[PDB]
C-alpha cells in the first residue's frame, strides 16, 4: 500500500484529436463508396443481365460494400452526440467479413477456372453466394452479440466475459480478415499469372498487372491495421510491457489505421469491375444515354 501507482491513464485528448479525422474519412468513404458500388451494380444489371459467375460475385461484393459504408453515417451521428448498438455493429461486421469472403471467392472462382478448367454456371454461383453470406454472419457472431446499449453508449461488458475474449477476438480478426484472405488470393493469382504470362493471350500483360494490383492494394490498406492489432494483442497477452504513454500511442494508431482500411471498399469497384473494358464501355454508354 505504497503511494499507489494506481493512477488512471487518460485518453481524453487522443479521442478529441482523432474524432475530426475519423468523421472526415467516414464521410469520404460513404460518398465514393456508395457511388462506386452503385455504378458496379448498375452496370451489370441495367442494360445487360448477369452473364458469368464473376458477375454474381461482383454484385455481392458491391452489395457488401454498400451495406458497410451505409453504417458510417449512423456512426457519424453517434460520434457527434434510434441508434441500435447490437444491430448496427452486426451490419458493420457482417458486411465487412462478407466483403472479404467474396473477394476471396473472386480468386477461387478464377483459380479453378483457369488452371483446373472448372467453370461455374450462374445458378451455382448464386448458391455459393448464399453460403458465404451465411458464413459471414456466423463468423461475425462473437463481434456484435456481446455488444449492447448501456447509458446510451455502445459497450462490451468485459467483466461478465472471460479475459481471453478480447484476445481471441483479435486473433480471429487477424487471421480471418487478413492472413487467410491474403494467403488465398496471393496463391491463386500467382498460379494464374504464371500460366497466362506464358500463354498466347493477347491481353496476358494487363491481366497479370490487374491481379498484382489486387494484392498490393489489399496490403497497403489492411496491413497497417492488422499489424497494429498484433502489437495490441501482444499487450493483452502480457508478452510486452505497456506504460500509460504506450497505450495512448497504440490507441491512436488503432483508430487511425482502422479508418484507413475502410477506404479499401471504395477501391473494390476499380479493382474488379471497371478495370475490364466491357464494363468500361458499358458505363460509357450508360452515362451517354442518361445525358
Amino acid at each position, epitope marked *: 500500500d505504497y503511494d499507489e501507482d494506481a493512477t488512471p491513464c487518460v485518453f481524453t485528448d487522443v479521442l478529441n484529436q482523432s474524432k475530426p479525422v475519423t468523421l472526415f474519412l467516414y464521410g469520404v468513404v460513404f460518398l465514393f463508396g456508395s457511388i462506386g458500388n452503385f455504378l458496379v451494380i448498375f452496370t451489370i444489371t441495367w442494360r445487360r443481365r448477369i*452473364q*458469368c*459467375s*464473376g458477375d454474381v460475385y461482383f454484385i455481392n461484393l458491391a452489395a457488401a460494400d454498400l451495406l458497410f459504408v451505409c453504417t458510417l453515417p449512423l456512426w457519424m451521428q453517434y460520434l457527434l452526440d434510434s441508434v441500435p448498438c447490437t444491430l448496427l455493429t452486426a451490419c458493420f461486421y457482417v458486411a465487412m467479413f462478407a466483403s472479404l469472403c467474396f473477394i476471396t471467392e473472386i480468386a477461387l472462382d*478464377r483459380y479453378y*477456372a*483457369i*488452371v483446373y*478448367m472448372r*467453370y*461455374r*454456371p*450462374v*445458378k*451455382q454461383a448464386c448458391l455459393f453466394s448464399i453460403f458465404w453470406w451465411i458464413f459471414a454472419v456466423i463468423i461475425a457472431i462473437p463481434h456484435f452479440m456481446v455488444v449492447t446499449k448501456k447509458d446510451n453508449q455502445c459497450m462490451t461488458d468485459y467483466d461478465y466475459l472471460e479475459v481471453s475474449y478480447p484476445i481471441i477476438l483479435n486473433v480471429e480478426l487477424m487471421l480471418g480478415a487478413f492472413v487467410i484472405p491474403l494467403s488465398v488470393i496471393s496463391y491463386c493469382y500467382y498460379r494464374i499469372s504464371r*500460366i*497466362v504470362a506464358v*500463354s*498466347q*493471350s*493477347r*491481353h*496476358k500483360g*494487363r*491481366i497479370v498487372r*490487374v*491481379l498484382i494490383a489486387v494484392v498490393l492494394v489489399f496490403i497497403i490498406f489492411w496491413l497497417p491495421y492488422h499489424l497494429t492489432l498484433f502489437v495490441d494483442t501482444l499487450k493483452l497477452l502480457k508478452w510486452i510491457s505497456s506504460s500509460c504513454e504506450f497505450e495512448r500511442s497504440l490507441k491512436r494508431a488503432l483508430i487511425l489505421t482502422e479508418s484507413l482500411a475502410f477506404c479499401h471498399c471504395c477501391l473494390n469497384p476499380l479493382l474488379y469491375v471497371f*478495370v*475490364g*473494358t*466491357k*464494363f468500361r464501355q458499358e458505363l460509357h454508354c450508360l452515362l451517354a444515354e442518361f445525358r
Partner: nanobody, 116 residues
Framework: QVQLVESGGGLVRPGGSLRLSCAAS????????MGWYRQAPGKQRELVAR???????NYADSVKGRFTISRDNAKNAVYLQMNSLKPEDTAVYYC????????????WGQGTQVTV
C-alpha cells in the same frame, strides 16, 4: 497470336441444316465464353448464339428454338447446329471469344458465308 478458325458454312435449301465450327488455334486459358455473330447486307451486326464454359446459353429472339449452340472446354471450341434455316438467316457468321479478368472480346474470326 490466337486466331479463331471457322468452318462449316455453305449453301443449303430452305428448311435444311448446317453446323458451324469454331476453335482457337493458339494456347489460351483465359477464355470463359464464346459465341456467334452475323451481319446481313444493309443491316447491323447482331448476336445469335452465345455460350459460356459454365453452361449458360443465350439465344436471339428470331433464332431461339431452331439453332443449338454447344461447346468443348480444353479445346476452346464452339459448334452451332442450325436447323430449319430461313432465307432471312442469310449473312456472314463471325465467331467471337471473351476473356476473363481483362474482360476483352476482341477475339474474332474471319467470317464464314451462309446462304439459304
Amino acid at each position: 497470336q490466337v486466331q479463331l478458325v471457322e468452318s462449316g458454312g455453305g449453301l443449303v435449301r430452305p428448311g435444311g441444316s448446317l453446323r458451324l465450327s469454331c476453335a482457337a488455334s493458339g494456347s489460351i486459358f483465359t477464355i470463359y465464353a464464346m459465341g456467334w455473330y452475323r451481319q446481313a447486307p444493309g443491316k447491323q451486326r447482331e448476336l445469335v448464339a452465345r455460350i459460356t464454359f459454365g453452361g449458360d446459353t443465350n439465344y436471339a429472339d428470331s433464332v431461339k428454338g431452331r439453332f443449338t449452340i454447344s461447346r468443348d472446354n480444353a479445346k476452346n471450341a464452339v459448334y452451332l447446329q442450325m436447323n430449319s434455316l430461313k432465307p432471312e438467316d442469310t449473312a456472314v457468321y463471325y465467331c467471337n471469344a471473351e476473356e476473363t479478368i481483362v474482360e476483352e472480346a476482341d477475339y474474332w474470326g474471319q467470317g464464314t458465308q451462309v446462304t439459304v
